[PDB]
Design a protein around this nucleic acid. Sequence first.
RNA 1: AGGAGUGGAGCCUGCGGCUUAAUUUGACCAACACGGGAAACCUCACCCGGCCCGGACACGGACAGGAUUGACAGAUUGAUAGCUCUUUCUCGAUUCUGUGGGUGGUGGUGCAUGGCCGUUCUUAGUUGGUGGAGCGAUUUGUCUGGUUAAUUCCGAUAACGAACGAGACUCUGGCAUGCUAACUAGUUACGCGACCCCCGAGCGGUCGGCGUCCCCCAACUUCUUAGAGGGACAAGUGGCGUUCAGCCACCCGAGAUUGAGCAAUAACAGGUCUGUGAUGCCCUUAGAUGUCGGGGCUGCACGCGCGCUACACUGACUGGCUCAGCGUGUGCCUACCCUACGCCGGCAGGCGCGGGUAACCCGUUGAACCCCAUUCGUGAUGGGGAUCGGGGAUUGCAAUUAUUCCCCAUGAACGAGGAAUUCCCAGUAAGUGCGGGUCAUAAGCUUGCGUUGAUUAAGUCCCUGCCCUUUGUACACACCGCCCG
RNA 2: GGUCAUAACCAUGUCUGGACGUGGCAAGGGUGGUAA
Lengths: 63, 227
Amino acid sequence: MGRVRTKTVKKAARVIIEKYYTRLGNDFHTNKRVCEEIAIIPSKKLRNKIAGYVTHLMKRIQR
Amino acid sequence: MAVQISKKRKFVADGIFKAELNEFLTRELAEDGYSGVEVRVTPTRTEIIILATRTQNVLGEKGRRIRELTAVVQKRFGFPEGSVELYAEKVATRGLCAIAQAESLRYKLLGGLAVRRACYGVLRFIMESGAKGCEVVVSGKLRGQRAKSMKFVDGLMIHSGDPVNYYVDTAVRHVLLRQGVLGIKVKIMLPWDPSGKIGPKKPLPDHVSIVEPKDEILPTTPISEQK
RNA sequence: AGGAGUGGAGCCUGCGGCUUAAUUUGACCAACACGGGAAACCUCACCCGGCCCGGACACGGACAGGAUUGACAGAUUGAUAGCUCUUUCUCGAUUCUGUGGGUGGUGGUGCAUGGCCGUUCUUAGUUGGUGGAGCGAUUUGUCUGGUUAAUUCCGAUAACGAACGAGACUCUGGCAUGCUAACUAGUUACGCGACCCCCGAGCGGUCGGCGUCCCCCAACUUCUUAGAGGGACAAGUGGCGUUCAGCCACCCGAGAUUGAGCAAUAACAGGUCUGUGAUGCCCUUAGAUGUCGGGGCUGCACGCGCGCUACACUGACUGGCUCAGCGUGUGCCUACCCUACGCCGGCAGGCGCGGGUAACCCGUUGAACCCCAUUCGUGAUGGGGAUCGGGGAUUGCAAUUAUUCCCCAUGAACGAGGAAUUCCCAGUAAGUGCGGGUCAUAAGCUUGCGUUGAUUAAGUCCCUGCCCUUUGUACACACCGCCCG
RNA sequence: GGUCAUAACCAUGUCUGGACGUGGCAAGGGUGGUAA
C-alpha cells in the first residue's frame, strides 16, 4: 500500500470529533455527510479521507 | 464566415491583438503607473479600459493623452471612426498591483539609490496594503562586476501546484544603468480567501484547512407545549 | 532474473581529421538526427566579383546660363549596372561639397550582464523567532525506537510554537440504462411504398430475413456528444503491530498506487551577445562588417556517435477476405488549402466539373501487421537492393554535383555479429501503420495517435550511484586533494 | 542458555575562480459631476 495520513488530516480530525462527539455514528457514509454540513471542506476528496479517520477514532474512544 | 477567419484561427487573431497592445502601451505609460488593460468589445464599440494607479498623470492637459492614443489605434489596426474609444480607470489598493509596484521600483532605482533601502521601501508598502507575503529579488551587478543576488522576503509564499495561478501575481522588469543591466522580479501573494471578494477559492496555501463552527448542548426534560 | 538490441555489413545523418579560393559558426553523464540546422536560389554568418546610400542633425562653403537627378546609342561589361568613358538633354535647391556629429553590424567579449534553460537532485531536503548550552566559530529545535514511498506519522524529549519543499491541488484515465438534451449525433418503432432472393415457415401468395431511398408535426437517448453530481475511505472482515502509527491476506467491488503537469533553499565562472529595437564596453563605418551575380556550407587515405534496412520458410511473391484513433484544411503576409466526382493515360500524371470557414464537405477517414488460397525450396536462391545505364513526369526563375516521383535494365556487401555496452516491469517490451511539426518541391528525423501484444521479477546492496547516522584526516583549488626522496 | 564466516591487483594528475560597509521611518492628493 504505502501512505500514512498527513498532519492536516490528523490535526483537524481531532477537533471535529471533540465538539460534535454525539453526532457521529460508526458508519463511514453518515460521518461523511455530517462533516460536509457542520463545516466547510475545501475539497471532496479531502473530505472522504478526514471522515474515514474521524470514524476510526470513534471506534477506539468508546473503549 | 466570409471574409473572416475560421473558428480555430479566430481566437488566435484576438490574442495577437491583445498582446501587441499590452506591450505598446507599457512603453509609454509606465511612469503614469500602468497596470494592464482590460479590453471589451460591446455592440458597435470597443472599450479599452486603461487601468492605471494615478489618473492625474494619465489625463494630461485637457484630456490630451487619451486623444493621441485613440487616434493611433484607429489607424494602426485600420478600424473606421467611432469604433475604438479609450477610457481610464483608477485601481484601488496598489499593493496588489505587482506590475505597477515593479515599475515604481524601476524609477526609484533609476533615480539613483542603493538596492537594499529601495527594496525595503517597496516591501513594507505592499505588505501594509494587505498581502499574505511578498518578495523582491534584484539580480545583476553592483559593487564589483561579478553579478549577485539580494533576496528580501516576508510572509508566506507558494511555488508549487495549481494554487500558484490564483494566489500570486508576478512581474519582471529590466532596468538600465550606465554600466550593465539589472533584473527585477516581484512576487506578491494575494490576501483574499473565504470572505472577500468573494473571488479566491477555499484551498489554503500548502496546508488545506477546515474551519469548524461550535455548538453542541441539550437541555431536554419531559414537557409538551400545546399550540 | 530475463526480453529485444547496439558494437559486425550496406546506407542516411551529425562530429573530428584531411583537403580547399572558401569548405562559415556555436557545442565535447550535463556536445555529437543538437542550434526544431532535412542549406538548389533565398537563408548566409563564408569566399570571389559588381552596384547602391537608405551618412540623421548642426555649422561653414557652393549657387539660379544654376546647387543637383536620370538616361537613348556606341565602347566597356556575367550584366539591357549611365558602373565607367564617348555623345547632350532632362530635373530645379529636395541636393551637393568640407568639417563636426552619428548610424548600421549574424563584428568581438556568455569570464562585463539581463532573460531563459540544463544540471547538481527527482532523492527528501531547507530556515528564522523566542528560550537553553558554549569565550567563540556553532549547536539544540531538525530526535534513541517503531512506521512510511516521503523531515510521513506515532512516540520520546531543553525546548515551544511556526514556515518552505512533501502530500494536498490541477489536468488525464478507469465506474453510472440516474439527472440535463440533441435534423451539424444516433437508435428504435412501424408506416412503408420501392428493389431483391425464396432467401427462411410456407408455395412463388401471405408472414419473416437483407440494406438503401422513403421516413414523420412518431417514440426514445442504451450507443455518440458535455455539463452538473455521485463513487474509494484502509471502509468492512480476519491476522499482525506498543495494539499506537501502520502492515499483510481476504470479502464487497472498478481497490485505497492510471499517467502527467506544477515544484524549495543554495549553487555552476555550465549553455545562449547567431531569438530579442534586452544590454555594457571595445571594434568597424563610404575603397563599409549594411545590397545584386556566381561559388561553398555535400569537397575524401582515416576515426567516432544517433538511426534505417537486411541476412529468409514463424519467409517472400501473386490473388482473395477484413478491422481504428489523435488531427488537419482556401477565405491567412504581400496569395495561398483539403479534395469528392466524370473523362484521358501502363505509370508518374494531365484534363473537365462540384463541395467544404468545417459533429455539416474531404471521410461511416472501407490503414498496416494480421487472415485464407496459389507459386518458390534451404540454393548468396526469386533472400538482399547497394551500385549503376537508358527513358518518361511534376515543382520552381532555374534541378548541372544527378530536388522529388515513375518505367525498364544493372544486381554489391551481407550467411546473425569480437572486446565491450544500452533500454525496459502491463495494454509495458517488441512487431505494425497513420496524423502533426519543418514544407514552392521532400522524412530513414522528431512529436502525438491507434492496432497486435509476450517472456521474466514481486528482490538485494554484489557492482554503479544516491540519502541518513557514527568515526578518522597533515584535505577546504575540497582525493581530479596533499605530500616524500 | 547462545552461534555465523573468509582479505590477490588498484600507480598518477595539464588548472594563474568566487559578488560583504554602516540603523531615513517618510506619495500625501481630489477643477469634472445627478443635485449644483
